[PDB]
Design a protein around this ligand. Sequence first.
Ligand code: HEM
Ligand SMILES: O=C(O)CCc1c[nH]c2ccccc12
Length: 346
Amino acid sequence: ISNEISKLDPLNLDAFFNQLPSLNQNLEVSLLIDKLREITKSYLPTTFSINDALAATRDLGMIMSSVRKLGIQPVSAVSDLEVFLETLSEITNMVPRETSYHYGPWNPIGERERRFTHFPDERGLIEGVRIAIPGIELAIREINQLSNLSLNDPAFESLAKSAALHVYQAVDGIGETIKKTDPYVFSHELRPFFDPIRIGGKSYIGAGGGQIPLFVVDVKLWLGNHSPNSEYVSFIKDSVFYLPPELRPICVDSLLEPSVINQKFAEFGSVEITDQVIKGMESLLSVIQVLLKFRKPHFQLAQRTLSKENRGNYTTGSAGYTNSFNHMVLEFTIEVEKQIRAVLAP
Ligand code: HEM
Ligand SMILES: O=C(O)CCc1c[nH]c2ccccc12
């Protein structure tokens, strides 16, 4: 629950985070490192509650990401971080690194907001995931209920409508990014804060738009267990254990089970096609069209950011993929809209 994490400052870093964008702007790597050492000596993370460790992972993660921006592996330099992060990871049962959950919904609104830089373009990513994530999560719960409901039941269509409504939040989030974040300023000023960090022999990618649980929607709604060697399934496979634990069993189940649409494709061609059954199948295509209204503008944005003109020193997002990945997720989704449009043609 996000409001009880956002209000916490378990490492007393609030004043520091008002200095951070200037610290980062003047490349003051010594205050960064001095703060990491101070933390591993001023706090026994073992005594933390779950909410405390989640907010600590947010704050420590961003200081760590700021050191890695300059090119220094932060745990390699402050060796005592490794057991500190170990202990945080045990309490949270999440990666010893911040994700878009800590960057968005668990990031406080207003004066306490944790930001890497003074550029207003940064706000376009934070607001983007802070809006997207709550609505996808609600859609996730509602979409899971469609499996155990008949197309002919109005309850099916009302759940799918509520889910398409909640997914629109991700549209609102990506529209907020498109208006606030300059593709050039992002690549040159923001992107280098989301680079991999080596912690205990493993490398943990930085925060990413792709960490919003939208892929969980995908897996349950249309991907399921039908594209076993996809590159999309490998990304999801790599994402499962970055998600909060609450979401992992849904995602694992859905990867191992036929999708809602694939089953509802079957029930449709095997039952008395009533008027409610078509409304029900039309509410599935509504959800998918809401996904398209997100992926289409998202694609253009990453395309402008990664053009020769604006890409700066990168050719990939923080998860290591080019725009080819988004093109592939978008075509998957487009093709799903074509299959439903076909089932519905009469
Ligand atoms: C300048 C802004 C942005 C750029 C250049 C960008 C670019 C990318 C890239 C390159 C990927 C491939 C995965 C990776 O390597 O990280 C990706 C994936 C993804 N990103 Fe973005 N992104 C931006 C903003 C956002 C925001 C604000 C959100 C959420 C509100 C978001 C949501 C996603 C999602 C859901 C995926 C998974 C693929 C899909 O579902 O289409 N992105 N993005
Ligand atoms: O999603 C990506 O991989 C690139 C966009 C991106 C990097 N860090 C981010 C943090 C929050 C929201 C979006 C991003």
